[PDB]
Every structure is written in C-alpha cells, then in structure tokens.
Design a protein around this ligand. Structure first.
Ligand SMILES: [Zn+2]
Ligand SMILES: [Zn+2]
Ligand SMILES: [Zn+2]
Ligand SMILES: [Zn+2]
Lengths: 239, 238
C-alpha cells in the first residue's frame, strides 16, 4: 500500500531518508520525516492539494525526525489557513516527541499531537498498533501494525529483529504488506536486520516482504533472488 | 572569507539551509548544520580530504541543527579512525546543545563538545566571540565576531536586530565581512531583519554587508541597488 518519499539508511541520502506515505482525499499520511526529506517534499508536488498532514513516528534519530520541525512550520505558516495547525503528529507517549521538537524551538501551537500507549487511529481512515522494536538503546523505537483499506501492513521502523508473533502473522497470511528495515552488513550488535538474517527468519510469503532503509552496499539483485521485494522512492521523487 | 553550503530561509530549501564554511588544511569549519544540509554535503566532495570537522552553533531551529546529528554519526562511523570522534561542536553553555542532540539519540561519545560563555577558538586558527541576538522567544540565539587570517567577520546567525556596538564597528571600518540574516517581509514582531530596516540602520560600508538566510520573496535586485551584497551557495553546491 505504501509509496516512499525516501528509502535509504542514514548515510545513503541519495535515496532520501526512510519514510513511507499515502496520499488520498486531500490527506497526506507519512511515517517519519528525516532531516533530508523536507527538501525532497518541497521539490516535489506532493503537498499540492493537501488539506491535512499526518505524521506517524517510529523514533527520533535525525534521519527520522530531523526535518519534521521544518514541515510543521511550513504547514503552519504556509498551507491553508495561515497560523492554524494542519499537521497532526502521532507518537507513543514514551517517545516524548514534543520534548525533541521543543529542543528545536517547535512549540505545540504549531501542530496537533496525539499520543498513545498501544494504538490509535486517524473517506480516509487508518489504524495503528504499536510494536516495540529493538534498534538502539539510546531511544525507544517502534514499528507498527497498520490497518488501511482492509489491508494489514507491518512497518518495522528501524529494527534489528522481528518478533516471533509478527513472523507467525506473516507466515499464516495475516500480513498483506511487510515493510522491513534491511541492510547488507552482517555483524554482532547490528542496529539493523541483515539480509542474511531476514532470509533465515522468513521462508513463507517472501513475496509480501519489502526491504527498506537500504544502505549503500545493499545488494538488490541478491534480495530479489531470495524472493524479497526492494523498495525505491516513488516516481514522484525520482528524476 | 566565508562560502555557503546553503543560504536560504527555512522554507527556501532550494538554496539550502543557511550555513557558512571554511575548508583549509584538512579542517572543515562550518556554522550550523540545518536539516537540509547533510544531503547537500554528502552529494558534494566537501568531506574529501577532511581530517577534522568543527561546527559552531547559532541556535537550534531545525534549519540550523536538524542534520548535525547525521553529520556527527557519519564523521564518527565513516571518516578516518572509525568510532573515534572526528567532529567538535562549539556552543554557548546556555544553548544546551547536548540536550538537543541527545533527544535525537546522539550521545556525547560520538563528538567533542566545547562550551563557553564569551569566546573560544579552534596551521588553521580561528577565534570567535559570542554576540547574543534576538530572534525568537523560544530559543537562545547568537551571532559571532570571528577572527580568521587577520580579518574580522560578523555573522549574525538568525537575528532581527544589530547590537549598537556591532553597528559602530561596521561604521568605523572594523568589520571586514558582515553577514546578516535579511528577509523581504517587514512586519511587527519579525523574527528576521527586513531589508528595509537593514537599509535604515546601515549607511556606511554597505559594500561589506552580505545578505543571507534569504526567503523566497527576497528582492536581490533591490538589495544590490541599495549597495548590499547577496550571498549564494558556493558553486560546489550549485
Ligand atoms: Zn534510520
Ligand atoms: Zn534509527
Ligand atoms: Zn533559520
Ligand atoms: Zn531560526
């Protein structure tokens, strides 16, 4: 169901920062807004015809929150009714997203913030359920089970593992689209899931698995040979 | 003395975020590192041959700090000796830059931090003196008087005023390069200095004044008619 504003790892900025979106009925829904991505959005026509923006947060690394404040300010000052919020951030309460934004001078008057512990929701309807994922110990990091147009989508966020319960859902056909942070590098303490490990953990329904957050060394040919899909920025974001 | 990685206002991202630099003797010195700019830097050869990075901070708006953490991580993990700090951040103590960086998961082990109240410094030699400036009520914001290769540089940061002592220095010929946040809009409570106000405040040495942080509406032809210079990204970034 998802298209991508960006799909690279933090240093692979030619693909943009990893961020998926849905645009429908004047609503722009996106997961994360990394440092590189506000400029990509502004150079595209993605915001044309958009009445309301919704941003769902996975964690606050710079390649996931670094330009959210730019987008908040732009939507507040320049979109629709000037100086009225038209962007809603959704985040787990424990992430303390407002404190991160306030550190950059982004105050609550500029956006709407909906926080939750377990789940929440936003003709456009979307639901999401938190899946805490391990990534770095410095930050609380999340993926999500997302329900949209009667499809079930798993979106890992940045993650170096997959819960056995989520794997079982995928194996049993209960996840229609499975977006997974995957990297080529394979090493102890990896903060991302290697392609090798992904191939060891998923045998069934590989055709529903989409590798994202791709590092510069990522071997797309090998990923496809194994039966996985590899995401790329949407054609809107490619020359 | 300065070249620019970017020179736009927050929404004018085709010019990049406002950030000046010097690259000399394996040292890359930059003022701020806004969200848009790590990608600009990575697409260029700016980091080629660089041994040490120094970032001086004016304030922590997203278009000034949003990708500093990306650059810290890249320099720590990918430049030179892997997992040894490559980058030194300079900031006034009151800015609390480490708390901002910690919020994005950027820990103190990944960079060197030098904080000060009044002044500090870094073959390559550079000195800076803090100039507190008004900009927004949410943040403590600063410009700087910078000494480099026997030239005196004023760099406003984001600012909606010029301190009288800095104006006098400019009028008296004591500032060689005067970089000023300037915008076209002119309104009560403006968080930047309008071109109109700049023209009312500065009469002598306008030829040493460089308008930066340019908004999408900025009238470069009018600024040049008034005798000011207009900054642009260095050709490396165009
Ligand atoms: Zn990431
Ligand atoms: Zn991350
Ligand atoms: Zn600014
Ligand atoms: Zn600012």
């Amino acid at each position: 169901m998802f298209k991508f504003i960006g799909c690279g790892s933090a240093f692979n900025t030619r693909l943009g920062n990893n961020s998926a979106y849905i645009k429908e009925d004047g609503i722009l829904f996106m997961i994360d807004c990394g440092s590189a991505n506000f400029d990509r959005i502004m150079r595209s026509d993605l915001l044309e015809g958009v009445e309301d923006i919704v941003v769902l947060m996975t964690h606050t690394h710079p390649d996931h929150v670094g330009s959210l404040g730019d987008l908040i300010f732009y939507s507040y000052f320049c979109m629709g009714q000037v100086k009225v919020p038209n962007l809603t951030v959704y985040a787990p309460y424990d992430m303390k997203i407002s404190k991160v934004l306030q550190g950059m001078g982004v105050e609550r008057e500029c956006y709407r913030l909906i926080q939750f512990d377990n789940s929440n929701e936003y003709g456009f309807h979307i639901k999401f359920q938190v899946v805490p994922n391990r990534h770095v110990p410095e930050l609380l990091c999340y993926g999500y089970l997302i329900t949209y147009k009667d499809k079930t989508i798993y979106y890992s966020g940045d993650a170096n593992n997959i819960s056995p319960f989520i794997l079982r859902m995928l194996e049993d056909g209960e996840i229609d689209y499975f977006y997974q942070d995957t990297c080529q590098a394979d090493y102890e303490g990896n903060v991302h899931l290697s392609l090798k490990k992904l191939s060891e953990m998923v045998w069934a329904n590989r055709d529903r698995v989409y590798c994202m957050h791709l590092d510069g060394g990522f071997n797309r040919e090998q990923a496809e040979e194994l039966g996985f899909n590899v995401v790329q920025p949407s054609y809107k974001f490619m020359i």
